[PDB]
Design a protein around this ligand. Structure first.
Ligand SMILES: *[C@@H]1O[C@H](CO[C@@H]2O[C@@H](C)[C@@H](O)[C@@H](O)[C@@H]2O)[C@@H](O[C@@H]2O[C@H](CO)[C@@H](O[C@@H]3O[C@H](CO[C@H]4O[C@H](CO)[C@@H](O)[C@H](O)[C@@H]4O)[C@@H](O)[C@H](O[C@H]4O[C@H](CO)[C@@H](O)[C@H](O)[C@@H]4O)[C@@H]3O)[C@H](O)[C@H]2NC(C)=O)[C@H](O)[C@H]1NC(C)=O
Ligand SMILES: *[C@@H]1O[C@H](CO[C@@H]2O[C@@H](C)[C@@H](O)[C@@H](O)[C@@H]2O)[C@@H](O[C@@H]2O[C@H](CO)[C@@H](O[C@@H]3O[C@H](CO)[C@@H](O)[C@H](O[C@H]4O[C@H](CO)[C@@H](O)[C@H](O)[C@@H]4O)[C@@H]3O)[C@H](O)[C@H]2NC(C)=O)[C@H](O)[C@H]1NC(C)=O
Ligand SMILES: CCCCCCCC/C=C\CCCCCCCC(=O)OC[C@H](COP(=O)(O)OCC[N+](C)(C)C)OC(=O)CCCCCCC/C=C\CCCCCCCC
Ligand SMILES: CCCCCCCC/C=C\CCCCCCCC(=O)OC[C@H](COP(=O)(O)OCC[N+](C)(C)C)OC(=O)CCCCCCC/C=C\CCCCCCCC
Ligand SMILES: CCCCCCCC/C=C\CCCCCCCC(=O)OC[C@H](COP(=O)(O)OCC[N+](C)(C)C)OC(=O)CCCCCCC/C=C\CCCCCCCC
Ligand SMILES: CCCCCCCC/C=C\CCCCCCCC(=O)OC[C@H](COP(=O)(O)OCC[N+](C)(C)C)OC(=O)CCCCCCC/C=C\CCCCCCCC
Ligand SMILES: CCCCCCCC/C=C\CCCCCCCC(=O)OC[C@H](COP(=O)(O)OCC[N+](C)(C)C)OC(=O)CCCCCCC/C=C\CCCCCCCC
Ligand SMILES: CCCCCCCC/C=C\CCCCCCCC(=O)OC[C@H](COP(=O)(O)OCC[N+](C)(C)C)OC(=O)CCCCCCC/C=C\CCCCCCCC
Ligand SMILES: CCCCCCCC/C=C\CCCCCCCC(=O)OC[C@H](COP(=O)(O)OCC[N+](C)(C)C)OC(=O)CCCCCCC/C=C\CCCCCCCC
Ligand SMILES: *[C@@H]1O[C@H](CO)[C@@H](O[C@@H]2O[C@H](CO)[C@@H](O)[C@H](O)[C@H]2NC(C)=O)[C@H](O)[C@H]1NC(C)=O
Ligand SMILES: CC(C)CCC[C@@H](C)[C@H]1CC[C@H]2[C@@H]3CC=C4C[C@@H](O)CC[C@]4(C)[C@H]3CC[C@]12C
Ligand SMILES: CC(C)CCC[C@@H](C)[C@H]1CC[C@H]2[C@@H]3CC=C4C[C@@H](O)CC[C@]4(C)[C@H]3CC[C@]12C
Ligand SMILES: CC(C)CCC[C@@H](C)[C@H]1CC[C@H]2[C@@H]3CC=C4C[C@@H](O)CC[C@]4(C)[C@H]3CC[C@]12C
Ligand SMILES: [K+]
Ligand SMILES: [K+]
Ligand SMILES: [K+]
Lengths: 993, 294
């Protein structure tokens, strides 16, 4: 699957002849292939079906999640536990089973976290399947001179294939004979434009010529014949589907951030481990003691509950987004939005409302205004000229939409109309001041209609004339004003006709620019009376050859219409500009209108200017001005069809407000691939399959939901349900919000690591009784700290997030050294000191003063010394001193909770004060209450000395950690104060996360 | 990367900062940690002011006294060959370490030792737990009281010919008064004979019913010839108020011990404020695994 040979622009053999192509495929133009030859090729080339994707079994990635940084350390912990158990079982009789339990539990922790990571790294991709639902089941092939419908997979290169309006093109064909055949290249051109397929050649670009039908498209109307030039994975839609399924996924920003800290955490873990293991044997420690050490140190360093906290945090924000109408398929896409700095959106159906209303009209060299208000409370437009009547007949006849059955009750403007928004707006205006269109339509029977063509750029039809004294034929046609202007020679002025001298041609140009500058879309309507002498009432004008005079028509007048903007569109554009997200308008209407919509939504800020605007303000040629004095620019599609790569790089590198008009959504992908290249996260907004290769390679693909197709939505990462644009801004804000909270929660979880690491370290350097066991640790990181860390996600904003520029990926991170200096360096140190305080207090009250504790470990752990003298001379048996050590573990754990109170409060806000933000987060309050209730339950419940080894505490001990907690609160409060008064100083570049 | 983040020569940076940054960070951490240390020390000094020097505030984790012995057994087993002398050396070195503290040379003069009843007697209260009266006085405990296990005659103490000794001792507790069982109809079988109220009885037996026969004649040595501890050596006033204090001892000779076979012997003290524990196998009683393999 060579990607570079698939990234290249398609080439072809279109510029050929009918004789030169059969030879290339061994076929007959009037008899097709033979059945024997057909099967010989069917076996030579393979079936005409897209290849299935390479797949990934599920136990592979689950087993992968079981091996990754924190899990390897916990694995070596379980292994060590079983090693120490084996040693005990082979060296001593009646071996307590404490170590085997601790090991089975560590293995359980690894197994469950794995599940949380599997849930986070999901890749729900069924691309090729959506594509497979494309190709009809059976095609119509002509072999040996006979017509047969065979399994499309059985079509080969060379046979003759016939198509009919409504059927799907089974392969890439070379049209040989057509009969008014039209195709819908929505998949390559991105447009529902009905391109006609003619046997003749018309453009050097194979995608633009008409003598080629393409797989993945459908013949809207007409019938055609053709030779098969491409089949299978080689068709056009074949490179589209193979390219979509082939793109290596990669690694989202939040993933790279989660990797960076596992690296740092592991650094301090191995540094402390290999070093103290060598130290343990440099001091004479035996093997069964060093193994216990190693384990305690590994558990102490690894935050056994973090990763699962992150996975939850992210799940909560995804539910908030679904409440705001943004549904996310992949968990990490929640954060990719905040880190975005470039957006490629569309104007039709997202910014605008697409609901069209008739605003202005041109006729009798005079602009007329129509009432465009809900309750119809305004000014009429003078319905007394014949011109208006002819206009009503043109629009009311040359229009295929009709009100939805059963609307006889609603008003003329609020009823449902089945069709495009332009035909609907025209139908409503005619039904508004011209009465019932249904009778106006039955009053003139439509004989033949030639639907809209992407090449003809017009809709025409010849209906009968209701004239009782004139039994002739009427022809009407509508289309772009330029195309229609080129097809006339008379003008219906006040009823009579007149020539098309340049005076009215210039009045028509000024009228076109008047309606265009108003942000409206204009259309031209013309008609002509066919002479009944050259086309009698019996002659049938089949839509095949030139039966109607394309030129010499009678232009009656232009018809504009309004598409207003959405409520939040101006606000959303302002929000994007405030944040620093480069917006890029890509649409498919005329640039004269595109500029107006740009000025109307914000893309072109009130003040910026284009090179043409400067040339017009200084009435000088455009080749003289310097392109650096122009902030914005309107790039045309044709000029995009003929543009190199580096040029596009410079186009995006030198302009802040770019707008692309006359663009075929194919080119879109090109612009997206040009936006990612410079170094910025890219999002995109799409609706169909032409956007599939663009949504897949973008950092984040935003697909529409109501108007979008299964292919586009199933291949994207984020789906919108209201098709609005304000939701994009909301997504970016929520992506930032869930980021600052992850920082706070990480500092939280980390801070308590020091009070768990230090007891062990003093255990080896000073030789004092073990202060904090391993079971107590697991009870701290897996118990009391989970709920608070989860609550830290519900924190609201402090300042304005939608105002700062996007974070830099190469310099700003998630876990820097500032946080390490706070959690590991300052707060954690105070918490460790408080724990040691409560420790020494418990031992001093029972008889072991601090001077006699240094050096006692060798005998304090000796299981056969039933006489250990304390500071007062009392003799303590082994189990009696062990009970006190366990009670010291219980109080150490409670001290941890007490200091965690002030840590959760100083972690709530990063800069602001508590008396400003406020304790409005009910989850945090519930976390504190539950955190205390759990510690009291674990200590006071009967039988906890048989299970967890935790004895009850005497009410005077619980108050040994209070001063340290208040001190932590005061220190962080004064910390978060100099930052506010001294911006850019020492406290900021040293302690500001 | 590798080289630059280590030492660049344009900005004169090492590891990432200049000399003034490393100096400001180091100075800050030194002041911060210094304040932390001073605060912890102050909070520990107030703690030294909150406790008394003559008595432990909490005495509940040591209410039922233990029962230890003189030999140091790794797994509560005494195994030694009567031929190879380098087999019972680790034991004798201990026994000796324990008895070496009851030497008469140590116990001499009026201060701080006092001659007490050669026959078991009652308690003796030397006042309260104060410093008003000077260093209290403790009763003298002679070596010779232990007759065949004293290391004065047969230094080895028995281990030389298949007749080891075991010096039992009651764990020292401040203000603890031993209370023996009264003469009422409910009393164990053993305790009936020789009910000297003033003596806390110690009696050893076999863990299993079978082993009875294989254990021979348990001969106890003690103050007055009884198998117990005289109440006159109580209570204990603590190290600070009674340095140079000796706790009674009881010797136990396991004469007539079957050869080449593991014997489980459980010794137990009886009394009111004495209670055993199924978890702590040294609370009031003790177990020994003797095996004189020769
Ligand atoms: C408490 O009392 C201990 C015993 O006291 C003895 O008996 C009491 C009743 C009094 O009569 C007292 O005056 C006695 O001394 C006392 O321990 C004793 O200390 C002495 C002095 O070091 C030891 O003498 C040395 O003996 C060794 C060999 O010892 C063998 O036997 C012992 C067991 O008894 C084994 O443990 C050894 O391994 C040996 O198998 C001699 O080699 C050594 O030679 C030295 O002296 C000679 C002159 O005699 C010189 O020529 C040499 O150069 C050496 O300098 C000594 O003769 C005696 O062994 C030891 N007894 C025991 C049982 O260990 C103890 O110190 C007192 N403690 C306190 C705190 O008061
Ligand atoms: C602790 O307790 C024992 C037992 O006390 C006895 O049982 C208690 C449960 C309770 O009911 C007491 O009231 C009760 O006395 C004390 O030892 C006992 O002492 C008596 C008296 O000497 C002994 O009785 C003797 O039994 C002999 C045969 O076994 C008999 O020949 C003796 O004759 C003597 O008395 C008669 C009058 O009855 C007199 O005519 C004789 O000339 C001779 O003096 C006598 O009846 C018990 O056997 C003893 N019990 C045991 C187990 O030995 C013990 O003294 C006491 N200790 C203290 C310090 O108080
Ligand atoms: C008995 C013992 C008990 C101990 C108990 C305490 C337990 C230990 C507690 C914490 C362990 C700390 C471990 C070290 C942590 C360093 C953090 C770290 O490595 O983070 C990584 C950062 C990267 O950051 P970034 O991505 O933003 O970079 C962007 C750069 N761009 C953008 C320019 C390219 O790299 C950097 O910071 C650069 C690396 C700096 C390394 C400094 C090493 C200091 C370590 C020890 C000093 C001890 C001296 C003591 C004596 C003092 C004198 C009296
Ligand atoms: C010696 C012992 C040392 C102990 C050290 C550890 C201490 C840690 C524990 C508690 C610290 C408490 C700190 C008190 C802070 C109070 C701050 C405050 O009051 O700021 C007022 C705010 C600001 O309002 P505003 O102007 O923005 O409103 C605008 C309203 N508009 C919009 C309608 C106009 O008002 C609000 O936040 C709204 C009202 C919120 C009321 C919160 C009351 C609950 C406070 C604490 C819960 C207790 C936890 C106990 C844990 C122990 C468990 C056993
Ligand atoms: C919003 C949602 C709210 C939900 C709140 C839920 C709160 C749940 C509240 C209570 C349920 C607690 C479980 C009940 C345990 C009953 C245990 C029991 O009745 O034991 C009695 C006997 C003790 O007998 P003894 O005195 O003769 O022993 C003498 C032993 N000598 C002499 C050798 C020392 O037990 C024994 O023997 C053996 C002891 C067996 C140990 C079982 C303890 C389980 C260990 C850890 C699980 C705790 C996890 C925390 C869950 C928190 C949920 C919030
Ligand atoms: C926010 C949610 C709050 C709720 C979370 C709960 C908080 C605690 C969280 C984790 C604690 C895990 C620590 C593991 C400790 C195992 C201790 C152990 O194994 O000690 C070994 C003992 C020794 O017994 P022995 O042979 O001497 O007995 C002889 C009995 N004779 C002789 C009388 C017959 O054996 C025994 O105690 C046997 C009983 C085994 C005890 C298993 C306890 C498992 C505890 C937690 C696992 C579930 C947590 C899931 C919640 C996740 C929250 C996100
Ligand atoms: C910024 C940091 C904030 C820190 C807040 C800390 C809050 C601490 C909360 C409670 C303190 C623990 C409770 C103390 C209970 C001790 C019970 C006890 O058994 O005590 C006895 C000892 C005295 O023994 P002795 O040998 O002299 O007796 C001699 C007797 N003869 C003369 C007859 C021989 O008592 C003593 O040591 C008492 C000495 C205690 C001195 C420390 C004072 C603690 C400061 C404030 C407490 C909080 C109250 C106000 C709350 C305000 C809320 C906003
Ligand atoms: C049981 C646990 C107890 C824990 C108690 C801890 C108490 C210790 C608290 C603070 C002591 C540390 C003071 C360190 C002072 C020397 C630092 C120094 O050399 O700094 C130099 C800078 C001035 O350089 P520059 O910025 O002009 O140069 C610009 C440089 N360029 C351009 C690179 C940005 O200094 C500055 O900026 C000024 C910043 C000074 C730092 C203020 C931090 C105050 C924090 C806490 C005090 C509150 C204690 C409350 C306790 C209540 C107890 C009940
Ligand atoms: C990175 C994490 C660091 C974690 C810090 C852990 C702290 C513990 C570290 C080692 C503990 C060693 C044991 C402490 C005992 C010292 C003994 C002592 O000193 O006995 C002198 C006096 C006692 O006198 P007495 O004769 O009246 O008592 C009894 C009188 N009788 C019995 C005759 C009645 O004790 C006194 O005065 C008070 C002395 C209390 C000892 C505090 C010394 C702590 C040293 C540094 C801690 C600061 C750490 C800052 C973080 C640095 C990170 C680099
Ligand atoms: C010590 O134990 C021995 C047995 O090991 C006892 O002596 C035995 O007595 C039986 C008669 O009951 C004789 O058949 C054996 O020949 C004897 N053996 C020996 C080695 O003498 C002896 O009575 C016990 N002595 C004490 C004081 O308990
Ligand atoms: C048990 C005792 C003696 C250990 C004391 C270890 C102390 C001195 C260690 C623990 C964490 C360390 C700090 C952790 C993080 C940073 C940030 C980095 O960019 C420079 C080094 C610096 C500032 C370290 C300096 C030394 C430090 C404070
Ligand atoms: C606000 C902070 C920084 C103040 C900290 C003050 C520290 C440095 C003070 C508070 C209490 C003081 C100690 C209290 C008690 C004693 C015992 C005495 O026999 C010698 C001095 C000594 C050892 C003091 C040394 C200094 C000390 C620890
Ligand atoms: C603002 C700051 C400096 C105040 C710090 C107050 C310190 C000195 C107070 C706060 C809590 C107090 C301790 C709390 C609990 C106990 C247990 C009790 O059985 C004896 C007193 C003792 C050991 C206290 C000693 C003094 C103490 C540590
Ligand atoms: K941990
Ligand atoms: K994608
Ligand atoms: K932790």
């Amino acid at each position: 699957d060579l990607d570079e040979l698939k990234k290249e622009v398609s080439m072809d053999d279109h510029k050929l002849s009918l004789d030169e192509l059969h030879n290339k495929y061994g076929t007959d133009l009037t008899r097709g292939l033979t059945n024997a030859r057909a099967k010989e090729i069917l076996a030579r080339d393979g079936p005409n079906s897209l290849t299935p994707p390479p797949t990934t079994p599920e136990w592979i990635k689950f087993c992968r999640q079981l091996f990754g940084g924190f899990s390897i350390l916990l694995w070596i912990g379980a292994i060590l536990c079983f090693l120490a158990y084996g040693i005990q079982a082979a060296t001593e009789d009646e071996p307590a089973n404490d170590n085997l339990y601790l090991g089975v539990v560590l293995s359980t922790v690894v197994i469950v976290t794995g599940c949380f990571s599997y849930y986070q790294e999901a890749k729900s991709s069924r691309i090729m399947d959506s594509f497979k639902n494309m190709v009809p089941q059976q095609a119509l092939v002509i072999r040996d001179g006979e017509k047969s419908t065979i399994n499309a997979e059985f079509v080969v290169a060379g046979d003759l294939v016939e198509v009919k309006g409504g059927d799907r093109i089974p392969a890439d064909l070379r049209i040989i004979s057509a009969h008014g055949c039209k195709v819908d290249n929505s998949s390559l051109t991105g447009e529902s434009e009905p391109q006609t397929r003619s046997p003749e050649f018309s453009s050097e670009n194979p995608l633009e010529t008409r003598n080629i039908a393409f797989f993945s498209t459908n013949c809207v109307e007409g019938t055609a014949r053709g030779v098969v030039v491409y089949t299978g994975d080689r068709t056009v839609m074949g490179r589209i589907a193979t390219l979509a399924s082939g793109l290596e996924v990669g690694r989202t920003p939040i993933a790279i951030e989660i990797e960076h800290f596992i690296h740092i955490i592991t650094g301090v873990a191995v540094f402390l481990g290999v070093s103290f293991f060598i130290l343990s044997l440099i001091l004479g420690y035996s093997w069964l003691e060093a193994v216990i050490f190693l384990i305690g140190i590994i558990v102490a360093n690894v935050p056994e509950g973090l990763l699962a906290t992150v996975t939850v945090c992210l799940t909560l924000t995804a539910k908030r987004m679904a409440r705001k109408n943004c549904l996310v398929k992949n968990l990490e896409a929640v954060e990719t939005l905040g880190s975005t700095s470039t957006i490629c959106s569309d104007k039709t159906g997202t910014l605008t409302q697409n609901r069209m209303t008739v605003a202005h009209m041109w006729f009798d060299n005079q602009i007329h205004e129509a009432d465009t208000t809900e309750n119809q409370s305004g000014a009429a437009f003078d319905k007394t000229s014949a011109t208006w009547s002819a206009l009503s007949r043109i629009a009311a006849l040359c229009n295929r939409a009709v009100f939805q059955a059963g609307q006889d009750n609603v008003p003329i403007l609020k009823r449902s109309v089945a069709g495009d928004a332009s035909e609907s707006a025209l139908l409503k205006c005619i039904e508004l001041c011209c009465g019932s269109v249904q009778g106006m339509r039955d009053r003139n029977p439509k004989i033949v209609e030639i639907p809209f063509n992407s090449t003809n750029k017009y809709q025409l039809s010849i209906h009968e004339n209701e004239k009782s004294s004139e039994s002739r034929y009427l022809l009407v046609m509508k289309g772009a004003p330029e195309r229609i202007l080129d097809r006339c020679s008379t003008i219906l002025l006040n009823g009579a006709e007149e020539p098309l001298k340049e005076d009215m041609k210039e009045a028509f140009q000024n009228a076109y620019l008047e309606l265009g500058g108003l942000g409206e879309r204009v259309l031209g309507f013309c008609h002509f009376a066919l002479p009944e002498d050259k086309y009698n009432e019996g002659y049938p004008f089949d839509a095949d050859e030139p039966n109607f005079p394309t030129t010499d028509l009678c232009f009656v007048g232009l018809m504009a219409m309004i598409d207003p903007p959405r409520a939040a569109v101006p606000d959303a554009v302002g929000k994007c500009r405030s944040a620093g997200i480069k917006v890029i308008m890509v649409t498919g209407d005329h640039p004269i209108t595109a500029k107006a919509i740009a000025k109307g939504v914000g893309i072109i800020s009130e003040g910026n200017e284009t090179i043409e605007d400067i040339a017009a303000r200084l009435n000088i040629p455009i080749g003289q001005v310097n392109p650096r004095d122009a902030k914005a620019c309107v790039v045309h599609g044709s000029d995009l069809k003929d543009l190199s790569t580096e040029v596009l790089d410079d186009i995006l590198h030198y302009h802040t407000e770019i707008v692309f008009a006359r663009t075929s959504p194919q080119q879109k992908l090109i612009i997206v691939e040009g936006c990612q290249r410079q170094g910025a996260i890219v999002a995109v907004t799409g609706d169909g399959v032409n956007d599939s290769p663009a949504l897949k390679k973008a950092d984040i693909g935003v697909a529409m939901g109501i108007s979008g197709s299964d292919v586009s939505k199933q291949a994207a990462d984020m789906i919108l349900l209201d098709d609005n644009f304000a939701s994009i801004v909301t997504g970016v804000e929520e992506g930032r919000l869930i980021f600052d909270n992850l920082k706070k929660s990480i500092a939280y979880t980390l801070t308590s690591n020091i009070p768990e690491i230090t007891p062990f370290l003093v255990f080896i350097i000073g030789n004092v009784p073990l202060p904090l066991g391993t079971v107590t640790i697991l009870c701290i990181d897996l118990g009391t700290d989970m709920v608070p860390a989860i609550s830290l996600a519900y924190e609201q904003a402090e300042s304005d997030i939608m105002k700062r520029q996007p974070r830099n990926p190469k310099t700003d991170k998630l876990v820097n050294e500032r946080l390490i200096s706070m959690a590991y360096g300052q707060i954690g140190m105070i918490q460790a000191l408080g724990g040691f305080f409560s420790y020494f207090v418990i031992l001093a009250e029972n008889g072991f003063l601090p001077m006699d504790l240094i050096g006692k470990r060798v005998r304090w752990d000796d299981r056969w010394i039933s006489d250990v003298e304390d500071s007062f001379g009392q003799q303590w048996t082994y189990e009696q001193r062990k009970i006190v050590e366990f009670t010291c573990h219980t109080s150490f754990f409670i001290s941890i909770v007490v200091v965690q109170w002030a840590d959760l409060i100083i972690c709530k806000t990063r800069r602001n004060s508590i008396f400003q933000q406020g304790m409005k987060n009910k989850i945090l309050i519930f976390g504190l209450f539950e955190e205390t209730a759990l510690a009291a339950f674990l200590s006071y419940c009967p039988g906890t000395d048989v299970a967890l080894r935790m004895y009850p505490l005497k009410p005077s001990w619980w108050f040994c950690a209070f001063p340290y907690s208040l001190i932590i609160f005061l220190y962080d409060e004064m910390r978060r104060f100099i930052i506010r008064r001294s911006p850019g100083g020492w406290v900021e570049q040293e302690t500001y996360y | 990367g590798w080289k630059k983040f280590l030492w660049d020569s344009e900005k004169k940076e090492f590891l990432g900062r200049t000399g003034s940054s490393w100096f400001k960070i180091f100075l800050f951490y030194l002041i911060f940690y210094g304040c932390l240390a001073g605060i912890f020390i102050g909070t520990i000094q107030v703690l030294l002011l909150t406790l008394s020097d003559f008595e432990p505030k909490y005495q509940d984790r040591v209410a039922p006294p233990g029962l230890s012995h003189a030999p140091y057994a790794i797994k509560t087993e005494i195994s030694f060959s009567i031929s190879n002398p380098k087999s019972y050396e680790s034991f004798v070195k201990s026994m000796h370490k324990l008895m070496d503290l009851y030497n008469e040379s140590s116990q001499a003069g009026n201060s701080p030792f006092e001659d007490c009843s050669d026959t078991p007697a009652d308690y003796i209260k030397r006042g309260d737990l104060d410093d008003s009266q000077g260093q209290k006085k403790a009763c003298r405990f002679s070596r010779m009281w232990l007759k065949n296990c004293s290391g004065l005659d047969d230094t080895t103490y028995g281990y030389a010919e298949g007749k080891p000794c075991v010096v039992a001792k009651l764990n020292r507790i401040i203000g603890f008064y031993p209370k023996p069982l009264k003469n009422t109809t409910d009393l164990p079988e053993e305790l009936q004979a020789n009910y000297n109220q003033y003596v806390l009885p110690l009696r050893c037996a076999a863990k299993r019913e079978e082993d009875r026969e294989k254990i021979g004649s348990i001969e106890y040595f003690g103050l007055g010839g009884y198998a117990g501890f005289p109440l006159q050596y109580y209570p204990y006033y603590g190290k600070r108020l009674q340095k140079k204090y000796l706790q009674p001892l009881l010797a136990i000779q396991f004469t007539n011990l079957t050869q080449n076979m593991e014997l489980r012997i459980e010794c137990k003290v009886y009394g009111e404020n004495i209670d055993y524990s199924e978890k702590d196998r040294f609370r009031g009683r003790f177990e020994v695994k003797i095996e004189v393999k020769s």
